[PDB]
Design an enzyme around this catalytic site. Sequence first.
Site, short mmCIF file in Angstrom:
data_model
loop_
_atom_site.label_atom_id
_atom_site.label_comp_id
_atom_site.label_asym_id
_atom_site.label_seq_id
_atom_site.Cartn_x
_atom_site.Cartn_y
_atom_site.Cartn_z
N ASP A 74 1.67 -16.69 -30.80
CA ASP A 74 1.54 -17.33 -32.11
C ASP A 74 2.45 -16.71 -33.17
OD1 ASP A 74 0.28 -14.92 -32.45
OD2 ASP A 74 -1.67 -15.75 -32.99
N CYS A 112 2.19 -11.59 -32.14
CA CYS A 112 1.79 -10.92 -30.91
C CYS A 112 1.97 -9.41 -30.98
CB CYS A 112 2.60 -11.48 -29.74
SG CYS A 112 4.37 -11.20 -29.91
N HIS A 118 8.43 -12.15 -28.10
CA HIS A 118 7.01 -11.96 -27.79
C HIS A 118 6.79 -10.54 -27.32
CE1 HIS A 118 3.41 -12.21 -25.06
NE2 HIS A 118 2.92 -12.72 -26.18
#
Lengths: 569, 95, 95
Positions: free
Chosen positions: A112, A115, A250
């Site tokens: 989202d 992270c 991420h």
Amino acid sequence: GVTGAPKKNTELVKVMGLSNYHCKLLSPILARYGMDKQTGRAKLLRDMNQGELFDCALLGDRAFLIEPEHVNTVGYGKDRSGSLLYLHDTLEDIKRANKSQECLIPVHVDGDGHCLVHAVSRALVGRELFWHALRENLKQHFQQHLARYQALFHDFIDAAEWEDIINECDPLFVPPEGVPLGLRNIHIFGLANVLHRPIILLDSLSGMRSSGDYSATFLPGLIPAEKCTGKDGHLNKPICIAWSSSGRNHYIPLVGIKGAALPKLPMNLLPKAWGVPQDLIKKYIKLEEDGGCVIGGDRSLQDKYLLRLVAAMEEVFMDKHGIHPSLVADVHQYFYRRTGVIGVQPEEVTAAAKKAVMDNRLHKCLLCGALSELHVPPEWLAPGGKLYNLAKSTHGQLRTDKNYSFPLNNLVCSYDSVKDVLVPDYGMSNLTACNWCHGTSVRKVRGDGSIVYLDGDRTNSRSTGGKCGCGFKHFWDGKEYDNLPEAFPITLEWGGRVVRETVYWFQYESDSSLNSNVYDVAMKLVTKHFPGEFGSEILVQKVVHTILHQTAKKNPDDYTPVNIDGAHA
Amino acid sequence: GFSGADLTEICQRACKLAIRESIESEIRRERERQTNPSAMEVEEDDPVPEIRRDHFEEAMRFARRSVSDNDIRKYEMFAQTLQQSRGFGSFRFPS
Amino acid sequence: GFSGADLTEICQRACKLAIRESIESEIRRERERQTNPSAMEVEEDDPVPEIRRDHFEEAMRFARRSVSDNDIRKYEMFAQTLQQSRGFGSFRFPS
């Protein structure tokens, strides 16, 4: 119907009943709340004076340990993505350092955009529960030591950037267009200082020999080493994280396996310090004699306590949000995830689903568990709408005194004079067939999470035993019975009046006290149909003698339950 | 909603619980004294001279109700049959 | 599910199977010894002195349950109604 139930997203997969999205609905309140050891009730941090925002310094001893049985879970255990091949070069020396055993693993985290602290929280407790405190207090930690942050980075970071850097810690603050989806390493430096703990961010063997400092050892430089120890006098074993992709967007946490060997990080996979002198590796990390350092740890929190804490937040979440966070989560999956949009805000799902709570517009499928809603756009009842046209040729004029029931939509609409709209009482509106699998048994859901069962409705609570064969508990008169009750009529005559009444006679209950008692069944009927007659005590005797002679079954296993369509066929 | 005849039970079943605890300790004392007849310990006045609250706290566990709720809106509904055939209190002598 | 008076026919009908045997083994012995009336070695002291298990093995074949399981309900559903009209429970005097 292979596809009648959508696959549960990483945010929606519930491990021990705990899902990332559900934890996201409880983590921001954990920033100022704690769990009580006596009552189990949540308590504001203002009363237990842990500051307004949860002090993550206490979390320096927290390292997640994964069970082997929960490795295969998507979004909780091992990440299934291309990061598995990505870290193999690093995994070559991770394993061999601890005598060829898999000791440190990548962990899947929701993508989202936040992270980084999601991984750190997953590095600490393995859940999305303590992440929200990691940012908000970090913004304050940046502000308090900004001059000391300036002391190092005023020649490397623009002075105007630090105002934007503290804005990076803001929870729901969307940066302007073009910002890459990911948080910078500057937070981890603060986070390592905030946690009173070293944080290690890893990359592939190519990543270490890559000329970028995006893989580095984040040490608590702003916090002295004596403060970087646990309660036992030992330094906190660092939590480890890694890069999850070559695009660097991420973050993933690197945690050990619960009950297995403590991971050891070799020197070649131990990156250089980030913004602090290299000698601080010896001072801030519990270092070994062989040149490596111990990762993970044994001062971890068992999942049994965290289960209470999640429950301890669902307590206040009743009062604050007027809705259950799991009930919000299913609304997200079935109506917000229905649009295919990835990254929907939890807050919008919480507030809007309360409208479905207020009007009981949620109708849950009883077979496949689908949460269906009877959602109608406002213009469909306004002039020009669909149901607006039917009322004219089917029942004539729009009458303020006449309600318009629409069997096709099961909506019963009154006509409000000022608004010229047909207003269906969605409490009276009932879905008859699911919009996911067309199951006829689709029932309302209340705001407390209680499903509005009916007589003959079979609940999801496991039956501890019964002749039914359904294996689930059945709901009846507000109570949960293992079996469905036999029914047969009764014949009442008193004062010349005559009444038909049907008598439901529970039997073979696993719990003894729930079985029918004739002296209560008989008294209930006479009271229910003859309140205040004189000499009714004689009528009750005549009634009792009848029920006993009717329930005197020759074979005790002669079970002929009620015939209810849908529940059993 | 207790009757006038189920408070004459609470006030007796709370006596048997003090009668029984008296003979019990009266007998159980003679036992131990005969266990040690040489103990010579005598002149013990009484173990329980008094109804001693925590008897009523126990006699209330066997306290039933004679007239159930339906057995009241049976008479109270019969009064409003003798009544409701009255009510000329509007009557006033003119001038 | 045996009454207090169906265990008194597992204990009499277990004796009328010993009277039978001990009153037959007497008669059969008498006709037997008339084959050797001059034997002079007759009159065994006891053929069956004892109720002697393997009688209850047989007497248990005529054991009837007097009270059927559909009639013990009428009482167990009474006493449970004398209870459940009780239990003031959490009653506790102040302080």
